[PDB]
Amino acid sequence: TIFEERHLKYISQLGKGNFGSVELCRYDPLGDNTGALVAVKQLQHSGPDQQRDFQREIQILKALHSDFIVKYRGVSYLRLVMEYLPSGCLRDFLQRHRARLDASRLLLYSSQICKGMEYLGSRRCVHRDLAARNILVESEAHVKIADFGLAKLLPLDKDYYVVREPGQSPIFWYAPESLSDNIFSRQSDVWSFGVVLYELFTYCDKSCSPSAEFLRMMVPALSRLLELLEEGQRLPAPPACPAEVHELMKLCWAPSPQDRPSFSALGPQLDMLWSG
Numbered sequence: 001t002i003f004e005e006r007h008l009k010y011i012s013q014l015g016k017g018n019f020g021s022v023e024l025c026r027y028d029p030l031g032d033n034t035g036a037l038v039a040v041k042q043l044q045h046s047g048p049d050q051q052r053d054f055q056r057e058i059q060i061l062k063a064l065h066s067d068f069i070v071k072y073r074g075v076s077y078l079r080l081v082m083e084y085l086p087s088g089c090l091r092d093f094l095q096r097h098r099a100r101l102d103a104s105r106l107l108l109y110s111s112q113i114c115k116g117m118e119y120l121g122s123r124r125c126v127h128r129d130l131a132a133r134n135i136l137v138e139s140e141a142h143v144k145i146a147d148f149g150l151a152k153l154l155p156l157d158k159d160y161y162v163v164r165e166p167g168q169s170p171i172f173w174y175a176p177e178s179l180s181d182n183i184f185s186r187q188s189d190v191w192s193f194g195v196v197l198y199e200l201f202t203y204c205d206k207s208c209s210p211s212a213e214f215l216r217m218m219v220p221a222l223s224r225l226l227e228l229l230e231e232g233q234r235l236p237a238p239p240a241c242p243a244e245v246h247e248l249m250k251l252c253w254a255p256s257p258q259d260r261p262s263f264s265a266l267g268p269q270l271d272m273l274w275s276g
């Protein structure tokens with residue numbers, strides 16, 4: 001669980017976001033290039049706010065044990081060591097393998113993401129940044145939730161979180177209560193999950209992406225988006241989307257957070273659709 005920095009060999013950049021980077025490294029204590037590959041997250045900001053957030057991120061991921069959550073491996077002293085999943089993010093996987101993945105497969109991914117989120121909720125963890133770009137592909141038939149950089153643990157007596165600073169994620173995954181009042185909860189995660197369902201069933205095609213649809217539907221973008229959503233406007237059924245899948249999307253997009261189904265309620269429904 002403790003990795004020596006001298007043994008972590010830099011290979012390439014895997015991603016960035018906020019004030020951290022993820023690097024592909026080889027953990028190579030023999031120094032002969034035979035060591036295993038790992039993904040390593042580090043900060044680039046000395047600011048105590050970020051460092052405290054990163055410390056919290058590590059504690060959260062360390063305590064998460066799920067087949068559907070990216071595996072914590074350890075730390076180096078400053079760096080968070082995780083498993084490396086070469087298939088990359090689901091967003092890119094969907095775009096690339098579009099012609100191989102049928103509706104059953106998409107429903108399988110949906111079910112696995114749902115189960116991870118059900119576990120996350122059981123730990124009082126709000127993810128806050130659920131999106132296909134933050135889901136990793138373990139194999140053809142196995143996805144895992146990643147990117148816990150914005151994740152928060154809910155106090156025992158409170159089921160929601162209010163953030164001071166404005167969000168920095170693409171605005172089309174945010175629940176209306178997050179857009180308007182910076183309110184995040186397990187139910188705003190459900191809203192975002194609705195958008196993930198949309199991404200899955202569009203195969204993250206750019207031309208019908210959440211952004212592309214908003215520019216079509218048409219004063220600040222965030223205010224406009226809030227208005228559209230308040231009016232009851234929603235993303236359209238993806239091309240060839242099963243009706244039942246689209247219905248579940250719309251339920252995830254219930255305007256009031258209390259009217260959205262829970263992940264535990266969504267799970268059996270997705271399993272039923274996958275079997276059917």
Ligand SMILES: C[C@H](NC(=O)c1c[nH]c2ncc(C3CC3)nc12)C(C)(C)C
Pocket residue numbers: 014015016017022039041070082083084085086087088089133134135136146147
């Ligand atoms: C860069 C982040 N990646 C990670 O934290 C990762 C943890 N293990 C990984 N394995 C592969 C990848 C390829 C997609 C680059 N990313 C990660 C994010 C979740 C946003 C894709």
Ligand SMILES: NC(=O)Nc1ccccc1
Pocket residue numbers: 172195210211213214217228233234235253
């Ligand atoms: N949840 C949802 O429907 N979001 C949305 C609506 C219109 C345009 C872009 C995104």
